[PDB]
């Protein structure tokens, strides 16, 4: 399981259901801060379906806890994520995956 | 044991023999039928 | 020359010498019809380069069952050292590569008749007895504490005559393909000698060479090679020739090995230290 | 610290440019997975920041250009370049109307107007890191890019970038003019090769290089520059002398069916005309020569034969020679500096009259470019084997052939490895249901397709490393020689090679070189006979030893080969036989080489018998521990090589009519060839009879079947025949009432290897010999 | 077969076009005469016209011998050394 | 020129078919000083191979066959193939002596070395001194017409037999001596000059 450290809530309404968008702009990082990834820099939001198991399920679950314009430090475990294998040539394995997310809209 | 063989064994350095006549004044003259000498392979240093 | 069509015989003896691919030459006292042979010249460099190999056999071997007289027990004959010093330096020289300042149309017969003279080595054996007398030396690790076997005063010269060895290696391998084949069966070889700790960077570019000339040794290594090569990247500081033998091994004239395209970013991306 | 640094640390520069070197040779030669794997080590926003610095240092300006294009750019530019030379022209009506000089005799522009030749698209992916890994994998893509910024981003990083060379000031950006230049220029290249700049763009980039001229400032052909600066506008220079040759072949193919769709009709016309005149008897089969005696080629060829017998009337034939007499006018014939040609003559003859150039690779390119602009039509009739007209409906099904090939097309540069030898194999399989490439034959030897997909076969055969593709390549290829005429005259030239790759079950590069001359009369006897003899020297092999995959499953080491001349004779089979009919050229060439060599004959033909090595292949089909100890048997194998071998020497027998004829050779061919094997001995063999089932059930792999017999009647049919009465019901009697009324018997597996045995192999011996 | 063979008005109009090329070629491009070689050998030799360096023509005879010189296994087939050969000649 | 021939080693490619006619028209007209700028780059330069690349080339030149003649005649037996195809006439064409018009102008080169009276090259073609090997050319040319003489003698006793000669049998004939009038013309100029 994850655990969520949030930063600056929004609406606190609104929460992902199913049959919806969910557009997030997140950054990643590695535990020992060496990041990889951020959709921030490339100026295009991530625009993952709710449900549809596309995601890493890391990212997915985690998601469920947000709300609309949620901004939460996250992190996972590496069960939930790449466990043994890791992403080839990106992740070794056995990592956890400290994230940086927020919702734009659209739940 | 001495043999024959065939091309690729032509150009290559086991294919040379140098010849050595007997006396050894004069020996870089001009040769001739009758004149007696000693086969000699250039890298065993061996003598037929 | 060309023109003469003669034979010969055990004038001592009057026996004719003739044959019986493998045809074995043998004094026959009859006499036949196949003892007619023209014979032909030779050349100048190729006659020069055939007294050196006989000299140096005679050396080597001289050399070899020298050290292995002492191979297992300790002291408390000698060594040919200082002929074997000089004795390597010139074999350098003598396969030294042409430089990049030269004419073109003149640089190429400097550069053929390298490339026959190299070649006229290996054939005649020269590759065996150069490897077969560096493993015999190689079996001492330390400088002089494994050189106790034979002296102090024969100890200094065993730092510098393994570095000549890996530099002759290099002189007669660069640039031929039919002698870089030689190394598809023991590739293992030169791996597990790579971090010896001595002349370090001589068996560095004698791996460099090899790997650049011969395509066929490229598709005989797995991954527990690549791990032996990056290693020697983090005991070795940041050296800049180690990143173009990694780049060497990816392709080769045009062709590309997705078999260890991957294989180097396993062990070199994720770790990011 | 900062990366500006570098210009002063002198040993961390060459050390992380080596780095540089080795994300570009990593993903080299299209490798879409790790090129998404190393977008996480450099994300764009970084890399398209570093292409725009002014003061980063030499090296590493070029290196991270030199990462961008091999990361994003490359694996789509290499999948251009091998399909820019081809073109094919469909039927809309914006092709239906274009021509050569623009509607105003004045030039136009290179690269500014209309194309519509077939090119597919790209498709690339984006990339991401938290998408759920899948589990043999489909392909992977390449990562995406910004691409409509990107082609406003090199526009403007060049065009202050010619200025402030005009300004030549002391400090350039990125230390030297060479460095300033060369990789803003080699981007451009690759970005107009991909095509994908505006047709206003290439205006405005037409201006940067020379707007004196190109009017619908400093100029970049005006300038000192060195030589790596030159031959990237060779590079450059190359591509605007393609279109100008790519847009008259589309114009000329336009002028087609404007020509011979009112070109049609004037045969209806002229038909019609004449359908029903009574005007004379004998001229009018002068007139009968065309519409039912003439091929569709020779038609028109004698249609368009006017120039300094024509059935043309003098309107229609005015307006082909004002098409002509304008299109070498708009190539270099002046037909008694404002154009292209004249310009880039110019220019690269006075580079050679300033300096003494020793780059080899400039002068290369430099001289062949020139001679594309004195020897136009000479560029233009090596182009025209390339280009075809295709109907615009079939437009859908063609692309997806296209995009297939250019998937076979990148495996050639890959070295063989077991994931993407699946990705040839539906990529084959994809073409065998195109319903295309089986209605244009013309189409396929000219897109190369075959030359393409035949060394893949040769470079993974160089034992066996793969035989999972070779056997489905090769499969292909027999398929493609079954298309058409002209198709196995392609496939035919290369025996010489694939003959020598004879070195398994399933089909094999062996059965291809049959498959190119099978039920060819023309192509049989221009057959080379110094092919032949490799062929039975090959038979001399399979004829002194035994192959070791029979040593592999502990069969007994024979010193002949009984199987390897089962894929031997068989070829032979079909090179002197064509339509049921023996050919003569071959026939004699063929036994006299297996007679200089008898080893190509068995142990049993030097000091044994035909019947008593027969008979001893019998009993090994009996006593199992006596044959090999799993479809390969070892009995079956010998009686059916014997059994093959006799009917090659039965259908090389001279024809009859050339008997009563009595050529020399006709009738000592027939004397070596009954003195070879006895006729009693052939009697033994047709008479013994086999175990029949019943309406249990013998198996027939490992056991006598009439295909060995259907082999012995042919050959007294041919080299003896029936000339009294007393021999034929002698072996009538004791041959063929053993078996036709067991055959009766069944009236199944094995009476159908067992009625056609009969009803085409002895029944046509009786009908003959019915008088 | 000499008889059954179709005439042209019965054809797909995209197999006219295919035909007609082949016939165009063949008839009507490969009978011009172009006799540009005089031209392009002597301004290509008269470009010494500066301000003992080689002219032009003297560094494309100078380019083929260095070719023909690299110590290769074989010569390969090289079609620009082909449409400069005869054009010399 | 000197070089490329050197530099084939004896393969009838289009290379040695192309560098051929420049060589040809290079030497034109019996000129002087372009054969005398030609030998002493080559016995200088001492480079062995110029006269193998050609001793090589005359051995593969063809003459008559009359194994391959009736086989062209089969192939004439018909006319148009099935289908409305057309059958190219001259591609493959003409199946013997498809190397004439090369092995016309080999000899006719190097008739050209030596036609106006050059004494150096008539005591050249036949022995080199500095060279390590000597070839004797012009006992190769022997060799080669030896060659042609019981070729077309024995396309005479295959046409012994029947009365008139016809039309492809014509013309075989007459590129058959096209080829021997060149041999001979190029034979006499190693022996004009005395």
Same mark, same amino acid.
């Given at each position: 399981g994850v655990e969520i450290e949030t930063i600056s809530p929004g609406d606190g309404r609104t929460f992902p259901k199913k049959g919806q968008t969910c557009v997030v702009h997140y950054t990643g990082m590695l535990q020992n801060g060496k990041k990889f990834d951020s959709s921030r820099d490339r100026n295009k939001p991530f625009k993952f379906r709710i449900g549809k198991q596309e995601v890493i399920k890391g990212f997915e679950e985690g998601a469920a806890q947000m709300s609309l314009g949620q901004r939460a430090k996250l992190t996972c475990t590496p069960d939930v994520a790449y466990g043994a294998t890791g992403h080839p040539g990106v992740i070794p394995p056995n990592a956890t995956l400290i994230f940086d997310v927020e919702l734009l809209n659209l739940e | 044991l001495v043999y024959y063989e065939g091309g690729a064994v032509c150009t290559h350095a086991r294919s040379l023999w140098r010849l050595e006549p007997l006396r050894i004044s004069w020996s870089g003259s001009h040769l001739r039928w009758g004149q007696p000498l000693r086969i000699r392979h250039v890298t065993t240093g061996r003598y037929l | 020359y060309g023109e003469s069509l003669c034979f010969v015989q055990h004038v001592a003896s009057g026996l004719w010498l003739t044959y019986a691919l493998k045809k074995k030459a043998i004094l026959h006292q009859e006499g036949h019809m196949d003892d007619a042979l023209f014979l032909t010249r030779c050349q100048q460099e190729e006659s020069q380069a055939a007294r050196m190999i006989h000299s140096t056999a005679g050396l080597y071997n001289q050399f070899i069952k020298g050290l292995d007289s002492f191979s297992g027990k300790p002291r408390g004959p000698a060594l040919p050292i200082e002929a074997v010093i000089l004795s390597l330096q010139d074999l350098i020289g003598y396969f030294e590569p042409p430089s990049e300042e030269l004419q073109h149309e003149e640089k190429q017969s400097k550069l053929r008749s390298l490339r026959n003279r190299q070649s006229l080595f290996q054939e005649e054996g020269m590759l065996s007895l150069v490897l077969n007398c560096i493993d015999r030396l190689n079996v001492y690790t330390t400088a002089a504490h494994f050189a106790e076997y034979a002296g102090e005063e024969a100890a200094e010269s065993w730092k510098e005559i393994v570095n000549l060895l890996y530099e002759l290696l290099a002189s007669l391998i660069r640039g031929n393909r039919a002698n870089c084949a030689l190394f598809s069966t023991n590739l293992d070889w030169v791996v597990s000698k790579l971090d010896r700790l001595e002349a370090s960077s001589g068996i560095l570019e004698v791996l460099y060479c090899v790997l650049i000339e011969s395509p066929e040794v490229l598709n005989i290594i797995q991954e527990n090679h690549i791990k032996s090569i990056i290693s020697l990247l983090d005991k070795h500081g940041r050296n800049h020739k180690v990143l173009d033998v990694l780049c060497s091994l990816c392709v080769c004239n045009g062709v590309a090995v997705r078999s260890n395209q991957d294989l180097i970013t396993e062990n070199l991306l994720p770790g990011r230290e | 610290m900062d990366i500006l640094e570098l210009s002063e640390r002198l040993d961390l520069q060459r050390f992380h440019s080596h780095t540089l070197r080795l994300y570009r040779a990593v993903c080299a030669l299209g490798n879409n997975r790790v090129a998404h794997a190393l977008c996480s080590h450099v994300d764009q926003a970084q890399l398209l920041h570093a292409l725009e610095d002014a003061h980063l240092p030499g090296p590493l300006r070029a290196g991270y250009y030199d990462l961008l294009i091999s990361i994003h750019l490359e694996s789509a530019c290499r999948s251009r370049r091998s399909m820019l030379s081809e073109y094919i022209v469909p039927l809309t009506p914006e092709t239906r109307a274009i021509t050569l000089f623009p509607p105003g005799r004045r030039h136009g522009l290179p690269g500014v107007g209309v194309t519509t030749s077939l090119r597919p698209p790209h498709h690339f992916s984006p990339p991401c890191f938290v998408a759920a890994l899948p589990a043999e994998a489909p392909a992977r893509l390449s990562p995406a890019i910004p691409l409509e910024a990107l082609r406003d981003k090199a526009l403007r990083m060049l065009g202050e970038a010619v200025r402030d060379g005009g300004q030549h000031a002391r400090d350039p950006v990125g230390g030297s003019v060479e460095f300033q230049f060369v990789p803003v220029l080699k981007l451009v290249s690759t970005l107009l090769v991909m095509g994908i700049f505006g047709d206003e763009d290439v205006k405005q980039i037409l201006k940067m290089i020379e707007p004196e001229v190109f009017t619908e400032e400093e100029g970049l052909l005006q300038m000192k520059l060195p030589e790596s600066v030159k031959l990237q506008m060779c590079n450059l220079l190359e591509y605007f002398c393609d279109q100008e040759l790519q847009h008259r072949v589309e114009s000329l193919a336009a002028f087609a069916e404007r020509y011979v769709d009112k070109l049609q009709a004037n045969q209806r016309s002229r038909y019609a005309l004449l359908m029903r005149a009574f005007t004379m008897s004998a001229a009018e089969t002068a007139r009968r020569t065309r519409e039912f005696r003439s091929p569709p080629q020779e038609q028109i060829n004698m249609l368009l034969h006017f120039k300094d017998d024509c059935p043309l009337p003098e309107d229609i034939r005015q307006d082909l020679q004002d098409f002509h007499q304008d299109l070498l006018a708009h190539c270099g014939? =002046? #037909?008694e500096p404002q154009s292209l040609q004249e310009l880039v003559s110019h220019m690269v003859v006075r580079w050679a009259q300033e300096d003494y150039v020793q780059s080899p690779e400039l002068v290369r390119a430099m001289f062949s470019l020139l001679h594309r602009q004195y020897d136009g039509l000479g560029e233009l009739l090596r182009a025209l084997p390339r280009a075809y007209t295709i109907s615009p409906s079939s437009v859908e099904d063609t692309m997806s052939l296209l995009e297939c090939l250019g998937q076979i097309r990148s495996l050639l540069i890959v070295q063989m490895g077991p994931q993407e030898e699946n990705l040839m194999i539906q990529s084959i399989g994809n073409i065998m249901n195109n319903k295309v490439f089986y209605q244009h034959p013309n189409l396929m030897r000219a897109l190369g397709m075959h030359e393409t997909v035949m060394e893949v076969m040769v470079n993974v055969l160089g034992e066996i490393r793969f035989p999972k593709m070779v056997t489905s390549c090769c499969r292909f290829l027999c398929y493609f020689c079954r298309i058409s005429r002209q198709n196995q005259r392609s496939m035919f030239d290369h025996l010489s090679y694939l003959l020598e790759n004879s070195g398994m079950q399933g089909s094999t590069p062996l059965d291809v070189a049959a498959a190119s001359v099978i039920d060819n009369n023309e192509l049989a006897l221009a057959l =080379?006979? =110094?092919? #032949?003899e490799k062929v039975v020297s090959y038979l001399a092999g399979c004829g002194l030893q035994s192959c070791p995959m029979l040593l592999a499953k502990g069969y007994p080491d024979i010193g002949?080969?009984?199987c390897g001349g089962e894929r031997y004779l068989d070829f032979l089979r079909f090179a002197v036989f064509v339509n049921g009919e023996s050919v003569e050229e071959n026939a004699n060439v063929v036994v006299r080489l297996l007679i200089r060599k008898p080893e190509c004959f068995g142990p049993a033909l030097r000091g044994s018998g035909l019947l008593a090595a027969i008979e001893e292949a019998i009993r090994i089909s009996e006593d199992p521990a006596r044959d090999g100890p799993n479809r390969v048997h070892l009995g079956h194998a010998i009686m059916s090589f014997y059994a093959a071998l006799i009917d090659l020497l039965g259908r090389c027998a001279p024809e009859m009519h050339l008997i009563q004829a009595g050529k020399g050779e006709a009738l000592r061919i027939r004397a070596i060839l009954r003195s070879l094997v006895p006729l009693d001995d052939l009697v033994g063999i047709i008479s013994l009879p086999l175990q029949i089932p019943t309406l249990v059930q013998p198996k027939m792999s490992a056991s006598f079947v009439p295909d060995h017999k259907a082999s012995m009647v042919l050959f007294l049919d041919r080299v003896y025949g029936i000339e009294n009465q007393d021999f034929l019901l002698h072996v009538l009697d004791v041959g063929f009432l053993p078996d036709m009324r067991a055959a009766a018997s069944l009236d199944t597996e094995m009476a159908l290897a067992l009625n056609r045995y009969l009803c085409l192999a002895v029944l046509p011996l009786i009908t003959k010999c019915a008088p | 077969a000499c008889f059954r063979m179709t005439p042209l008005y019965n054809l797909p109009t995209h197999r006219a076009c295919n035909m007609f090329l082949e016939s165009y070629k063949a008839a009507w491009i490969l009978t011009e005469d172009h006799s540009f070689e005089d031209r392009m050998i002597d301004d290509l030799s008269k470009a010494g016209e500066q301000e003992k360096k080689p002219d032009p023509l003297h560094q494309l005879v100078l380019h083929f011998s260095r070719t023909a010189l690299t110590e290769k296994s074989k010569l390969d087939e090289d079609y620009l050394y082909m449409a400069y050969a005869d054009i010399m000649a | 020129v000197l070089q490329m021939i050197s530099a084939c080693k004896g393969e009838t490619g289009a290379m040695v078919s192309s560098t051929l006619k420049l060589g040809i028209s290079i030497l /034109? @007209? @019996? /000129?002087a000083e372009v054969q005398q700028k030609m030998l002493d780059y080559l016995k200088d330069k001492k480079e062995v191979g110029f006269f193998q690349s050609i001793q090589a080339l005359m051995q593969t030149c063809s003459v008559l066959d009359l194994n391959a003649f009736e086989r062209q005649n089969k192939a004439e037996g018909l006319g148009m193939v099935n289908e409305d195809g057309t059958v190219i006439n001259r591609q493959n064409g003409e199946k013997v002596m498809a190397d004439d018009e090369f092995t016309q102008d080999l000899f006719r080169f190097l008739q050209l070395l030596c036609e106006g009276h050059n004494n150096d090259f008539q005591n050249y073609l036949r022995t080199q001194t500095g060279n390590t090997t000597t070839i004797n050319i012009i006992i190769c040319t022997v060799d080669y017409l030896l060659r042609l003489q019981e070729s077309i003698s024995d396309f005479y006793w295959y046409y012994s037999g029947k009365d008139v000669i016809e039309e492809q049998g014509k013309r075989n004939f007459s590129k058959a001596m096209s080829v021997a009038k060149q041999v001979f013309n190029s034979l006499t100029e190693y022996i004009q000059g005395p």
């Open positions: - | - | - | 014939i =002046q #037909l =080379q006979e =110094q092919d #032949l002949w080969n009984p | - | /034109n @007209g @019996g /000129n």
